[PDB]
């Protein structure tokens, strides 16, 4: 399994140099190596296709067609919905479909949601507009 | 930004080396092929080609088609040929400007003297400019 700055790097997305002094500049500040290429470049869409591929998610460009089944919904409590940034948002074929808004929070959420799952990644604005719709207070 | 061109572009963004960026423009003297599509073969990220593209003719990259409701009366506004001969999808309306989702940026012109009204223009990548042609203009 590659790191993120090597699946970038393999793309073309930035340079040798780019990715050394990015990881040059984390080892003084802590920032997530995604963070600080997003701010010398490289697009914010871009970043969540690479962390998507790393992790087995799919990158959801948009979310203003999906429907939320409040079916699905009752899987989590809305306060584990905000608190792992995950939206189960229906079924297809036995797995509920589960989109998240950050690819390290994987594993807590497939452990805790115990059943079949397929998981989606979505940018920010977008994650954030599709848990309000299905989880509205 | 809308002065420079591709290449310039793209290093500037910090998306091609000027190493890359000499190979593919001593190659396009040879073969007169696009520039960016020599870019692209030669591993530039097709939606890096596309953003470049889109800053250097003040077009808005959409980075999805898969959101937009093709509104009825502004695809009347061009016939279903005009539509796929200039690669421009007319996707509704803001302010009294028609919105327009080109698959090329260098139609922009020619799209818009044809429309002969205010437009906001787009650049979408070719599948998702395909799909919502299809959607705007089923045959
Ligand atoms: N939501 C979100 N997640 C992000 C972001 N950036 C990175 N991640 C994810 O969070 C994990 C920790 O990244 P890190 O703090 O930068 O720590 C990274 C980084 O310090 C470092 N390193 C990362 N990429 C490379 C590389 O290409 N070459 C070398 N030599 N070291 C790398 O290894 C550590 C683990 O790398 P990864 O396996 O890829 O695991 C990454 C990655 O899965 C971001 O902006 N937003
Ligand atoms: N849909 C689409 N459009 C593309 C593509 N590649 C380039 N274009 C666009 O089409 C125009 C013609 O580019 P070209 O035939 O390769 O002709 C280019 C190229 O031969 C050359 N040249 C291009 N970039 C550079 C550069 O950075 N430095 C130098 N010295 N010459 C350049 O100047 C000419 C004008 O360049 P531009 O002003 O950028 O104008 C470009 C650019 O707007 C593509 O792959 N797909």
């Not at 948009?62 to 067609?65: A, D, N, Q, V």
């Not at 950050?102 to 929070?105: A, K, L, Q, V, W």
């Given at each position: 399994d590659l790191k993120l700055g090597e699946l970038l790097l393999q793309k073309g997305w930035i340079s040798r140099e780019a990715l050394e002094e990015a990881l040059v500049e984390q080892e003084k500040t802590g920032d997530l190596l995604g963070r600080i290429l997003v701010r010398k470049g490289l697009p914010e869409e871009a970043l969540y296709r690479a962390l998507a591929e790393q992790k087995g998610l799919e990158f959801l460009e948009?979310?203003?067609?999906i429907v939320p089944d409040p079916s699905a919904a009752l899987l989590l409590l809305r306060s584990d919905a905000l608190r792992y940034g995950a939206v189960p948002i229906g079924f297809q074929n036995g797995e509920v479909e589960v989109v998240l808004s950050?690819?390290?929070?994987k594993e807590a959420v497939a452990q805790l949601l115990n059943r079949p799952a397929r998981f989606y990644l979505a940018l920010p604005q977008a994650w954030e507009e599709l848990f309000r719709r299905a989880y509205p207070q």
């Open positions: 948009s979310t203003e067609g950050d690819p390290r929070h």
